[model samples]
Target: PTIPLSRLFQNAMLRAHRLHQLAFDTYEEFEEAYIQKYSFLQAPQASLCFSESIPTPSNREQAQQKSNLQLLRISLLLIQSWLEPVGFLRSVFANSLVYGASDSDVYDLLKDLEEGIQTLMGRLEDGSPRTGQAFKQTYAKFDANSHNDDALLKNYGLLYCFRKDMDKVETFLRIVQCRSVEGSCG
Candidate 1:
């Protein structure tokens, strides 16, 4: 049975894009306040995570099933890193900062992510469709690679770093869904 690999990937992109969007907005608002306090400054991030590179659409379909399965798993992990409430972000934001603040309804997006991953897994009737055990064991939490000792400002720093990783995740997800035509093995 051919699953809609693109569909699954796209839905994840949709979820991840918005989840990050909300967090991005919330962080910037806070950043502005941080600047006021210190003649402060800013930047995006370089250090990262997410797919090294998934097989592209241009690859000559030699191992299509193998490619598809690998993407399925990658997508699972990608979803978890962004939404798992107990992990990296929790280490900094706490429930107070992590959850909704002002217009940023952080809770539902994470809640939506948690709920949707399960919902997504259930839809596919195939090998190990229940991805919970695999999901938790494999990539449940992301490590914060860069942040200071101070709790508050570091939280500020970490959000940008995490944001960078998410930026890659979205790009990777788009590739997984399907890429623009280019090189192909003949």
Candidate 2:
């Protein structure tokens, strides 16, 4: 049976949320694994923990649908990478406060991360693949004035990957839509 588009979209978002939670809940382990794999490279502030290998469609005929699905998956993966660290840090602050250690610096960093995640989630909810100008604008809006260099760099990497995947999806979807329109008239 075919799933409705709305259902599919919601499922995608749900998967993203689950990934976010998982990464945040096990952040220490995640970072350990990341460091093991990429020890030579500086760790990203909001580490994705692992690299994702996006699947390429087998042929031109299946490219559109495959690319669309791939885009959704990659978007979710990247979003989780962006959000997980924020959630993890927020909880850390909350735990610290519970223990009577109220550090303003940690609180401020948490707030900034939250804001960035909020903006990214907003764009995801709109159901359009974020691209060049829109991607840059969103990054700038949430990240441009950030005091955390690591957070900023992490966002930069996620947005860069997201935009590239989104461009491919957009192109394929446009082609498919145009073809459908032509077929309906013909």
Candidate 3:
């Protein structure tokens, strides 16, 4: 017994959609947790409720750095979690030959992507949050000037993660087709 192409496509679409929705929902949960734990003058301008000087407001710049780094720390994990299923789905599609030619020799590409993500996350965990903050600060300019420049944030590195996530998904679908053909032929 074999699955039809239409059935496969529908299952893939449903899985992808569900995964995307889960990511968004988890992001909202993270945001909510941030809001509940931190006090702020307003909703969006959330910051740590430090009450002293040394680790307090004088280190405003440093504080921002810390905050952004922590954000990066949290965000990197979130991004990685989001990427896992996407990567698995992608590996499925990629193996099926969705991208173009079937590269039947490519085995365990999902493990490779997973390893890559793990390595990236491990570096982030070990590195100074200040470094991640710097990346965000440098990248923030892209968003700030986007409307004036007609350039989208997607043009920058931060957003590249998201695009890769999606590209992997598309490639996975194709791989699924390739795998199906091989199964029939063999």
Question: Which candidate leads the pack in lDDT?
Answer: 1
How many collisions per candidate? 0, 0, 18
Return whichever of 1 and 3 wins on lDDT.
Answer: 1
Local accuracy of candidate 1 as per-residue lDDT tens digits, 20-126? 67557656666665544334343333333452434333334332443433444555565566555433344336333434454335555555545554544454448
Q: Which parts of model 3 have CA positions greater than 4 angstroms off?
A: 35-186
Looking at model 1, residue 39 earns an lDDT score of 42
CA RMSD of each candidate after superposition: 8.6, 16.1, 19.9
Candidates in descending lDDT order: 1, 2, 3
Candidate 2 residue spans exceeding 4 A from truth: 1-145, 183-186
| Native-to-model Cα distance after best TM-score fit, residue 153 in candidate 1, in Å | 2.7
Using TM-score as the measure, name the better of candidate 1 and candidate 3. Answer: 1
lDDT at position 40, candidate 1 = 38
**Off by more than 4 A, model 1:** 1-10, 35-66, 82-104, 114-149, 179-186
TM-score of 2: 0.27
Task: Report the lDDT of model 2 for residue 28.
Answer: 35
lDDT score, candidate 1: 0.49
Itemize residue pairs with steric clashes in candidate 2. Answer: none
Question: Model 3, range 112-151, lDDT digits (tens) per residue?
Answer: 3333333333544544544333332311112212322223
Looking at model 1, which ten-residue stretch has the lowest summed lDDT? 177-186
